[PDB]
Amino acid sequence: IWTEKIMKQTEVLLQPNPNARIEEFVYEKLDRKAPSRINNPELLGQYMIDAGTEFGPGTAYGNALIKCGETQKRIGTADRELIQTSALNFLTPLRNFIEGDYKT
Amino acid sequence: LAADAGTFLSRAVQFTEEKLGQAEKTELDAHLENLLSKAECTKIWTEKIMKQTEVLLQPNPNARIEEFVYEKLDRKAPSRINNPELLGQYMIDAGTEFGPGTAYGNALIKCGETQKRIGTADRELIQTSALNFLTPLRNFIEGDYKTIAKERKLLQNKRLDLDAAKTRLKKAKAAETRNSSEQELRITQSEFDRQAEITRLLLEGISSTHAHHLRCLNDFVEAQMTYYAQCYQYMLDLQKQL
Amino acid sequence: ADAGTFLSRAVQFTEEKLKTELDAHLENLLSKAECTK
Amino acid sequence: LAADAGTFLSRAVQFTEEKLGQAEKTELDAHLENLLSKAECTKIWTEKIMKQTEVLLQPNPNARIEINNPELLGQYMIDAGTEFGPGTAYGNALIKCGETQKRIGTADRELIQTSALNFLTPLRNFIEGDYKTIAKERKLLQNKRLDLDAAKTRLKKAKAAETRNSSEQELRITQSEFDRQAEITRLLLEGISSTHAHHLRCLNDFVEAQMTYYAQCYQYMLDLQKQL
């Protein structure tokens, strides 16, 4: 009981958006790869960078916008890395146990 | 009062003929054209960043929809515990059930605490950012932009009148009527010029807007720094105990 | 025109919604197993 | 599963392009086209004739959905005759006329049974069988044609030679199924020829039924005249 609760909530913590999970479930049943959606940080970075470019790269405001966009994209990548590691060395074993030994 | 309807009629017919391409448009001064264009672009991007920021802060869209409903319903949206703190609660309860003496119990309970601390830190960032960033910008978009929009319409209307008068003079034959039209043309031109200055004056204020926003961005940054810094320290502490 | 671009976007989404072929022997076996189940 | 949805998407998109006229439409062979048209016409006309025949035999719509008018009139006449006095000449005539009116009603019921089972039934059977079966195959033939045209569109849009070669194979697959379905529908269309000959024999039966009805009714009226 406890193992199941923790395994689920921690997955929620990793993927906050419910619609995304629903899409994953559908694509899992569809047996087809779900599109590689861009995460919030990178998208925000893109918006900031493009906006800064439009206002003028030389301008201090533009410079800041571009810099922040770059950092934001870096953060997004790091986040993706974190998500991959957790599901590979944490969620996996627990799921294994609940799905195999428990049946026996 | 009926004369006003005639003015609305005149502005319309002219707008149609100009759209018909039969009539041309008196181009505005390049400076004002430039000023208006800059103000617009600014608003467009500022709006986009504000929205994407919000999404970043509150990932759950359904929650945002519920807030909108209660906002329109003029009711309070029930508060909810964030994912980090919730996980902590489940973990702590588990640890307790498995037995505090057991190392597994010790670890689970210890972690649940760190998670709740982290959740608290998260809410701090959300409030700090909202207070220091989103609002300042929102203000600008809701107030100054609106005013400028109104003035833009006034000048646009005046131009319509001017163009209509021109067209009327173009098709003026009777000397006396043509002279009256000349007086009418002078009349509209003056009013058009007056509004143009009014508009340019207001547009001048946009220059400071960029500087004001820059400060807000610097603040947001400081907030993120604060959030991660706290969380990092919290994590370190947890590993030491475990 | 604009309709064509909208159709292109629709097709892209269809692609969003929707391979090393294994040796025949294995494939045939896989099909057999599935049919049996 | 997902395959079902995918197939539908391809067919509809190609069809819309052809409807818009931007995309060309692969046509069918004249022989198959002629056969399909003949079958459609047969069902349309046969349907109308059978329905009107029902109205003619049973004018009452409610009765058609389900005592006949002649027999009801006969009842009224006989009752009146008794009240007016059976011995009275007026009473005598009313009673005799009512009886004959009921006999005519009986013959009408026989005609309805005889005709419907020898004329309406066969016409209905053809529409329920030959036409429907053809329509099902005709629909699948249109689906196969859409698949073929979609393959041709994919082929023309397959700039890559290897992709075009794959589209050629796909086109061949669609063509084979398309041609197969055409032949299946064609066989059903050939059956319509026999349907016409069968229908002709049924028409003759309906004619015979009407003649018997009129002949019997005439004799009944003759007898009443003599008695009165």
Numbering used by the authors:
A (entry chain F): 54 to 157
B (entry chain E): 11 to 252
C (entry chain H): 13 to 30, 35 to 53
D (entry chain D): 11 to 76, 91 to 252
Kindly provide excerpts from the paper associated with this entry:
BAR protein endophilin B1 plays a key role in multiple cellular processes critical for oncogenesis, including autophagy and apoptosis. These two motifs contribute to membrane association. BAR proteins are typically dimers in solution, where the dimer consists of three α-helices from each monomer that form a 6-helix bundle with a characteristic crescent shape.
Our EM structure of the endophilin B1 lipoprotein complex consists of six endophilin B1 dimers bound in two distinct conformations to a single artificial lipid platform. The final volume consisted of six endophilin B1 dimers and had a nominal resolution of 3.88 Å. Strong density could be observed for four dimers and slightly weaker density for two additional dimers. Interestingly, at higher contour levels the density corresponding to the membrane bilayer disappears, and where we expect to observe density corresponding to MSP2N2 scaffolds, there is none. Instead, we observe density that belongs to endophilin B1 amphipathic helices. Dimers bound to the surface of the bilayer and dimers that straddle the edges of the bicelle have distinct amphipathic helix conformations. Interestingly, no density corresponding to the SH3 domain-linker region is visible in any of our maps, either near the concave surface or proximal to the lateral part of the BAR domain.
